[PDB]
Each structure stands twice: as C-alpha cells, then as structure tokens.
Design a binder for this molecule. Sequence first.
Ligand code: ZWY
Ligand code: ZWY
Ligand code: ZWY
Lengths: 225, 225, 225
Amino acid sequence: GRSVDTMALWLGLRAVLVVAGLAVLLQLIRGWLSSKSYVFNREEIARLAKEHSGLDYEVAFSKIIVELRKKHPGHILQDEDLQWVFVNAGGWMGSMCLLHASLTEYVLLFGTAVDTGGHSGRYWAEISDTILSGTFRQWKEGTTKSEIFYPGDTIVHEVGEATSVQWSSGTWMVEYGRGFIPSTLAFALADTIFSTQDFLTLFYTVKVYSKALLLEASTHLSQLG
Amino acid sequence: GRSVDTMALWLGLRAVLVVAGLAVLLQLIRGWLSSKSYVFNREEIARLAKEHSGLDYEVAFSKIIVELRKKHPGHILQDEDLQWVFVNAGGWMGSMCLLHASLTEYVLLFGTAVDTGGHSGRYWAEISDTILSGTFRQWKEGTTKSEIFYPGDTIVHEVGEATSVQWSSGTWMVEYGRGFIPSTLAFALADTIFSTQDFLTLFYTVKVYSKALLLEASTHLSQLG
Amino acid sequence: GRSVDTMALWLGLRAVLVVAGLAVLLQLIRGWLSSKSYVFNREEIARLAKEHSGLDYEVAFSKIIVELRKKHPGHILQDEDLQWVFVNAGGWMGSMCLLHASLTEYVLLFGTAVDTGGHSGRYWAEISDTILSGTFRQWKEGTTKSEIFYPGDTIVHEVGEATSVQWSSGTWMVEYGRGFIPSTLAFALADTIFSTQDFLTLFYTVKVYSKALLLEASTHLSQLG
Ligand SMILES: C[C@]12CC[C@H](OS(=O)(=O)O)CC1=CC[C@@H]1[C@@H]2CC[C@]2(C)C(=O)CC[C@@H]12
Ligand SMILES: C[C@]12CC[C@H](OS(=O)(=O)O)CC1=CC[C@@H]1[C@@H]2CC[C@]2(C)C(=O)CC[C@@H]12
Ligand SMILES: C[C@]12CC[C@H](OS(=O)(=O)O)CC1=CC[C@@H]1[C@@H]2CC[C@]2(C)C(=O)CC[C@@H]12
C-alpha cells in the first residue's frame, strides 16, 4: 500500500544517496592527492588584471597577454592558437580565449556579450576571476542573498564550493584555475553534449586544450634537454 | 528520393509520436490512481504565507515554520535537518529548504538570489507558490502573453499544466505540492544530471527527501503504536 | 607520473577531437548534398513580415498567414492544425506556431513572453527571423560584442554559424528555415529530453511536424494526379 511504496522509494533514495556520496568521496580523493605543479599564482594574475581593469577590456587583454608571455615564456599560446570559443556550462553561455592550460593550471580570458547566468560547477579546483568590465553577481550556497562585483574585483571560487553566477552583457574577466583541471571537463562540456549539440564548438574546445597541453610538454622537454 | 526520405522521416516521427503519447498516458494512469492522503491543504499554506508576506522574508520563514510545527506536529523537519539546497531544473536555478515531504505532499521554502527562469515542469501534481518577496512572472501554454505576480499572490500550477516561469533576484515564496510527488523527481534532477554535474547537491537533495519520508513513517508508526 | 597523465589526457583529447571532427564532416556532407526543393524564398517571407511589423503582432500573425495561404495554397497548415507549442532549445525557452514544414523548408511564428536567451544551434540550415515586436540581441562567434535588432529587422543565421541569442519579454517574429531540416531536430529536442522532461510538448512537436510533412506529401500527390 502507501507504506510499502514509501519504503521502496526510501530504499531507492538511499541507493542514489550512497552512489552520489561515494562519487563525491572519489572526487575528493583524486583531488587532494592530485599533482600541484604551479607556474603561476592567483595573486599574480589578479594584480595583473586589476592594473589594466581601467582600460578598454580588449586593450587590457593584449597587455595582459604580453606581460604573461614576458614573465612566463613558453607557457602561453602563441597568437596563431588564440581563438574565441563559446562556453556553454551549467545553464550559462559565455566565451573564452585559452592562454595556458596544463594538468594542474589554466589561464584564460572569459566573458559574455549577452545577459546570462547559471550554475558555477563544483570541482576540486580553485577558480579566480578578476573583472575587467561589466558586473559579476555571485550567490553562495547556504545563503538567501547575493553579492555583485565590479571591475577590479576578484571572485575566488573555492575548492568544493558551488555558487550561482550571473553576468551582464559586456562583462569580461581574466580567469585562473588551479587544482585537478581534468575533473572540470565534464561540467564544461555537459551543456554542449545535452543541450546545444554544438559539436564544432566541442571540437574547438578540445583542440585548444590539447594544444595548450602540447605546449607545456614541449617546454618541459626543452627545460631538461 | 525526396519522397522516400519524407516517408521515412514521417514514419520515425510517428514512432516518437506514439512513444511520447503512451508515456503521457502512463503518467496520467499512475497519477489519477495514485494515493491521496493529505496532511495539509493549499489554502492553509497560502493564507499562512500571505499573512507574513509583509515581513522580511526570513522573518516570515521562521514564523511560517513555527506555525506549521504547532498545527501539524510530527510532519515538519526539525531545525537540525533544515538546509538551503540549490535547485537546478528546467533551465532555472533557485534554492529550497524542505520542511515536509511524503509520497503525496511536500512543503518547502523556495526562491532565488539571481535572475533566472525556464520551464516549470509537467507532472501529475498541483503546485502552489505564495510569494513573500520579489516578482514571479508566469507564461501559460497556448498564450502569447505573460503575467507578473507580487508578494501576497499565489500561483497555482495545475496538474498536467506546463508554463514558463521567471523570477527576479531576491524572490522568495512558500511552496506546497500535492499529487504523485515521485513523478516530479526526474524534472528536479535532470539539470543536475545533464548540466551542472553537481553530485553533492544531488546528494543533499535525496538526503533531505529521505529524511522527510522517514519522519512521516516514524509519525505514522507512532499514531498507531 | 605527471608527464604520463598529461600524455594520456592528450591522447583522450585527440580521440574526442577526431570524433567531433568527423561528425562535423558528416554533417557537412549530408547537408551540402541534401535536397534543395524550395517553395518559398527568404526575401518573400521577410518582406511580408516587415510590412506588418507595425501592427500588433497578433494582427500581423493573421495577415501573414492569410497571405501565405493565398500565394502558396496547399503548403500552409489549416486553422485546425495551428497550435502554440513551447520550444526549449539551447538553454532558451520560447514558443512556436508551425505553418509549413518539409524536408528542406519550414515556416513558423516564433517568440517568447519571458526574458530568455542561449545557444542558437549549429546546423546545415539557413534560418532567418523578421522581428514583429520586441528586441533580438545576437552575439556572433569570434567576437566580444553583440548587436540588438528591432521590429522590421531580419537576422539571417547562416549555415554552420553559431551565435548566442537573447530575446526580451514580448518579442515575436516570423521565421523561415531552409536547408537540411531534419538535422536540426536534435537541437530542438535536446532540452526537452535532458532538462524539461516535458514529453507532452515533445508529443506536440512531432505531431505538428508530421502533419506538415503529410500536408506537403498530399499536395505533391495532387499536383501529379
Ligand atoms: C568550465 C571552466 C571552469 C568554470 C568556469 O565557471 S565560472 O563561473 O567559475 O567562471 C567556466 C570555465 C571556463 C573555461 C573552462 C573551465 C574549466 C577547464 C576548461 C574546460 C579547460 O581546460 C579549457 C577551458 C576551461
Ligand atoms: C521540482 C519541484 C517542483 C517544481 C518547482 O517548479 S515551480 O516553478 O513550479 O516552482 C520546483 C521544485 C522545487 C523542489 C522540488 C519540487 C518537486 C519535488 C521535490 C523534488 C522533492 O521531493 C524535494 C524538493 C522538491
Ligand atoms: C530549432 C528551430 C531552429 C532554431 C531556432 O533558433 S533561433 O534562435 O535561430 O531562432 C529555433 C527553432 C524553432 C522551431 C524548430 C526549429 C528547427 C526545425 C523544427 C524543429 C521543426 O521541424 C519544427 C519546429 C522547428
């Protein structure tokens, strides 16, 4: 009867409960024990973006890239490999220009020309965004109130944290990721697989990531011989 | 040629046609014959939320919970089990605090701190939302015009009805569901499975639902012995 | 170690790379060699919608349908088969009224009563939208700036192009599609399959498409005997 169905539903809920729990546990285990070889530090990227946040965001883009190439030669994609690629993740739509990416880090220019918002993603990685233009509203888990951030500010998305993010038209930022970068690909590609069906954008995304990986491998081989 | 491909496509469309049709028919059969044991009634929840809609929505939250505990003891989750959990469904992102849930009913606090909107879901359940703060725009199926609702109003999402819903930042409401509650889980979890990949939020969602079910089972056992 | 994992990840990225690439290649092959039997032309639909863009969009709807029936008898669905059906695709939510659809073309009334936006879709089809009311913001791939279009304007979504689209509440338009129409169904239904779970809307969508196909088949049989 009604009690039997309640018990069976509770059994199935406990089944999904322990599956999701152990999946989170494995995410924590893979992440905490993951490698931590760091070329950059988030304060370095944040100060460099905050210095040029008063410029037109495209002029800021160029000066940030030139400085990143001067201070970290061999770790930034050349001009021929820079490309604006749409990003559809967690219900929002923006675009990116990948500058650096490895197993443990990534650096990219991010933003949107449309009003958008959605889920931030939850992963074992520390993501930081320094706003060059526009507005960035963040709604943290466990709260009923959100906060808006402006050019010059830096939002630090902590490891294991989940937020709601919302950007206005013409918002652009410099983004630095640190942690277990591969564990973020599922979030980055989900809306392409199950919503947009934009397989050429998927092609673009894995192409620039593979190029960034090959750049790091080529530089690591040259630093040893 | 062109006529052959048109016929084959029409055959496949009829295939998807009869599959979706019989799936809807089974949804109607399971729902109409589902159980209907009711602890609350929607007018009770709506009047209680409308009375406190003039307060700060968090003060309203507390007074509504206290009143629901006084009038329905044994059917509201204790303070230790209350938690704000993100809800990603039908393209929108809000958050909930589950107070009561069974096979046939649920009562929760709902809202969002970001501008969001999307599909309401179509299921065999009668959902009603009494706005405490913010704005609630509803766009009904079969019409080209939408309506906006304000604090004190109650939107009644009818059984089998589908709407587009849109909430502004800082909109909060009291929500009561009545019907075949399990048939709504697929809509509630879809964007977590196929977009956000937020498995810890999924863990949170099934945990509070299982706790609410266990509360109802514990109370039903005590009312008999 | 770290180099081994980098190589393995690069191998898997190249795997996804060549899969998505050949899927795009097959999309191009099917599309370029697809049939091109055309009842309408986009300038015809655009001028007819632009003439009536100064009217109330519902009065414009009726006059456009009457004119399309007068100039293309046997290719427009009768009043009994006209229906507003929700469209959930690429993260946005609108609604449509299908007037004509074949293997190579389609004509429909489109719009939304809510603020929405998302991915446009990428397919081998040329889509054109003439705005009757509201605002249409388009963000093209490879750019950091978007453009807004107004009643009387026509946006032409080119073959293979991907954009971000965003519409304000009360935006309505006349839409004409030309190309390999079946290759667009996956984009049109994805958010229904993996987000909204609205199987009755899916039932509605394949019903009107099958009816439009059957209309074209019936007219083609009568034009020969
Ligand atoms: C998916 C994510 C991380 C989460 C960001 O969301 S955000 O709101 O915190 O900015 C968006 C974002 C944009 C670019 C994504 C990045 C994750 C790592 C990705 C997939 C690569 O290896 C190449 C491009 C990278
Ligand atoms: C999924 C749904 C019902 C549809 C609501 O959408 S709404 O626009 O009508 O408010 C959102 C909503 C929020 C909480 C959801 C509820 C359905 C039943 C759920 C999944 C439980 O057992 C626990 C939490 C409940
Ligand atoms: C999916 C798409 C094409 C892309 C449009 O997006 S848009 O931003 O370019 O307007 C939305 C749109 C609406 C109606 C869709 C159409 C594609 C072809 C569809 C599925 C049919 O056979 C029947 C209804 C048609």
